[PDB]
């Protein structure tokens, strides 16, 4: 029901036979020419390998706006989302570094405490003697 590249609702969906995943024709045809392989599974795939498989949108009652207001909003919404998405990717990598550092910090505590505990237990076993 959606495309597995853009996040569309395809008008001419086509399925690849190497990995069962429906893409919109234009977007899958572009990928194969860029690099001839399936985008998801990274398996060998060509344009002839694809297999082609109706949607209604009710054009608004107030449908000038298509040139001015609607088209403007579309390139606003594309612009401010990807910019905000670039902001999200940058923080995930920073928050990655804080995760791995704190993880390795904990590893050293455990390693330090593994020597501490068993030797404290060992000393109790020796005390009896």
């Amino acid at each position: 029901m959606l495309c597995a590249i853009s996040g569309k609702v395809p008008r001419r969906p086509v399925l690849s036979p190497k990995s069962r995943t429906i893409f919109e024709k234009s977007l899958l045809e572009q990928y194969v020419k860029d690099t001839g392989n399936d985008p998801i599974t990274n398996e060998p795939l060509s344009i002839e390998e694809i297999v082609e498989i109706s949607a209604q949108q009710a054009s608004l009652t107030e449908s000038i706006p298509n040139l001015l207001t609607s088209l403007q909003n579309e390139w606003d919404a594309i612009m401010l989302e990807n910019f905000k998405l670039r902001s999200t990717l940058d923080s995930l990598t920073k928050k990655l570094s804080t995760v791995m550092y704190e993880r390795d910090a904990a590893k050293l505590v455990a390693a330090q405490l593994l020597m501490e505990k068993n030797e404290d237990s060992k000393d109790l076993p020796k005390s009896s003697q």
Partner: protein
């Protein structure tokens, strides 16, 4: 690595362990021109201005408003033709798309359940493991305490 979640722990212990982890952290410390204007538009927070002209205009203008007037006619005729083919079908075209949206919605919530089931199923397997070993650790500690006093009472 091993820390039993189901079997075991206060907020103070999280605050305690956080400080020890904190102290060990104290120690260690592809597009064309399109992308340039898009990133600049988003960064600056300003959308490029469109043609705010067709809406206002003015009568007895000049050769410039003669064009602007003739624009309003053709688009209003296109408008009135663009409203005719909508009203002909009317609400049938709208409710046909409304039905599609219900098929699209239910599919998502089926996946919500499939994920829900397998997520609870993994946790379900963990639970048994936690209770298996937690007993074995209990067995070990009891035996530990027995020796501890046994070795004393011999001596």
């Amino acid at each position: 690595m091993d820390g039993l979640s189901f079997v075991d722990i206060p907020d103070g212990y999280k605050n305690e362990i956080d400080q020890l982890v904190k102290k060990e952290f104290a120690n260690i410390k592809a597009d064309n021109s399109v992308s340039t204007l898009t990133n600049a538009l988003y960064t600056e927070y300003l959308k490029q201005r469109n043609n705010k002209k067709r809406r206002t205009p003015d009568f007895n203008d000049d050769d410039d408003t003669l064009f602007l007037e003739e624009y309003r006619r053709k688009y209003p005729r296109i408008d009135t033709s663009r409203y005719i083919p909508n009203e002909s079908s009317e609400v049938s075209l709208l409710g046909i798309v409304d039905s599609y949206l219900k098929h699209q919605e239910i599919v998502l919530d089926t996946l919500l359940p499939q994920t829900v089931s397998n997520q609870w199923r993994i946790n379900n397997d963990y639970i048994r493991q936690t209770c298996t070993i937690v007993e074995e650790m209990n067995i070990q500690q009891r035996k530990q305490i027995n020796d501890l006093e046994i070795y004393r009472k011999r001596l």
